[PDB]
C-alpha positions as a Markdown table, in Angstrom:
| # | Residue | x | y | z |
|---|---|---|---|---|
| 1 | Unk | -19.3 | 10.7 | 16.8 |
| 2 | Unk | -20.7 | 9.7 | 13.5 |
| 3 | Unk | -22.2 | 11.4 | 10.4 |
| 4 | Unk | -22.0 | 9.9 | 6.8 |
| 5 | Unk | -17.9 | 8.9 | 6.4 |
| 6 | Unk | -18.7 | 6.2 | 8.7 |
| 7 | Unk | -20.7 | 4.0 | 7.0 |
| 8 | Unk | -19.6 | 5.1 | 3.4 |
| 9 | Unk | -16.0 | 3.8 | 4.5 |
| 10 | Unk | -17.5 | 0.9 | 6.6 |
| 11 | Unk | -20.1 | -0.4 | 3.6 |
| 12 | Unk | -18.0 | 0.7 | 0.3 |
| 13 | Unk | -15.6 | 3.4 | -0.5 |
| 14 | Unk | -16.7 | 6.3 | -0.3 |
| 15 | Unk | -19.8 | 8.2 | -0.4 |
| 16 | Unk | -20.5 | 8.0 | -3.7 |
| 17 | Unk | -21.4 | 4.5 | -3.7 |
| 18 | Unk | -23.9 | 5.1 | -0.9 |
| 19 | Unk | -26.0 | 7.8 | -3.6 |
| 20 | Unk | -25.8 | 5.6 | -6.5 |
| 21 | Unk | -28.7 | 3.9 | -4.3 |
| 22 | Unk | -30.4 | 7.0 | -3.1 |
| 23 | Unk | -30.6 | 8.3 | -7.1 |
| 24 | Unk | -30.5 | 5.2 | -8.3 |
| 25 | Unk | -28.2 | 6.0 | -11.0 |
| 26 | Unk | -26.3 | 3.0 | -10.6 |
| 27 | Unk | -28.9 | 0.5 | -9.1 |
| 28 | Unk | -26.4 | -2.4 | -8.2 |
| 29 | Unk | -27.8 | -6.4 | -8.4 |
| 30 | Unk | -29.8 | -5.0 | -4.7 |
| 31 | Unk | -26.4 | -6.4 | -2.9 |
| 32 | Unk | -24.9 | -2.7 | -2.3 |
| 33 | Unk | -28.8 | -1.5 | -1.5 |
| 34 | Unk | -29.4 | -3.5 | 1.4 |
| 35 | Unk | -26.0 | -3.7 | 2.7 |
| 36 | Unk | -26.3 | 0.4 | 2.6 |
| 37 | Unk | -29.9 | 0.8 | 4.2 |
| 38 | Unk | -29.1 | -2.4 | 6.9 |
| 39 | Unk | -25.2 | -0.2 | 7.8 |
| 40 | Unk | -27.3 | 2.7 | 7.9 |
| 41 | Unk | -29.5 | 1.7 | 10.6 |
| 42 | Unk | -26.7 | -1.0 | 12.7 |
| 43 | Unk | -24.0 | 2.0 | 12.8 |
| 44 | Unk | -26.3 | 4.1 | 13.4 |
| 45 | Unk | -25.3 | 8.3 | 12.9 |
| 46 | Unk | -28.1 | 10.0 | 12.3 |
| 47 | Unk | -27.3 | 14.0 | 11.2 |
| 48 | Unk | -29.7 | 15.3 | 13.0 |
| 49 | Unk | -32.0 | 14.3 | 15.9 |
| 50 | Unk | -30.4 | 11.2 | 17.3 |
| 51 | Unk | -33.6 | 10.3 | 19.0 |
| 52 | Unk | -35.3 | 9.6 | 15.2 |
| 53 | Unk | -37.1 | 11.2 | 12.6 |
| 54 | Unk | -40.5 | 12.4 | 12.3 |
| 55 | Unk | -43.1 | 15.3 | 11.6 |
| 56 | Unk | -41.6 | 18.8 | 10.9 |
């Protein structure tokens, strides 16, 4: 089972890291960006459809 603590605790600390990126409040040197999107995608948790994403 997976969600979002996963990777947040995986990649950095918590997940407050992981929004700095999305609301790029804190746009780090694009180290933290990638490392976030490519955890994202290798853990794999998605919250909802675990097939993918698309349409409505």
């Amino acid at each position: 089972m997976a969600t979002i603590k996963d990777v947040a605790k995986r990649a950095n600390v918590s997940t407050t890291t992981v929004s700095h990126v999305i609301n790029k409040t804190r746009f780090v040197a694009e180290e933290t960006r990638n490392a976030v999107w490519a955890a994202i995608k290798e853990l794999h948790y998605s919250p909802s459809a675990v097939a993918r994403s698309l349409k409505v």
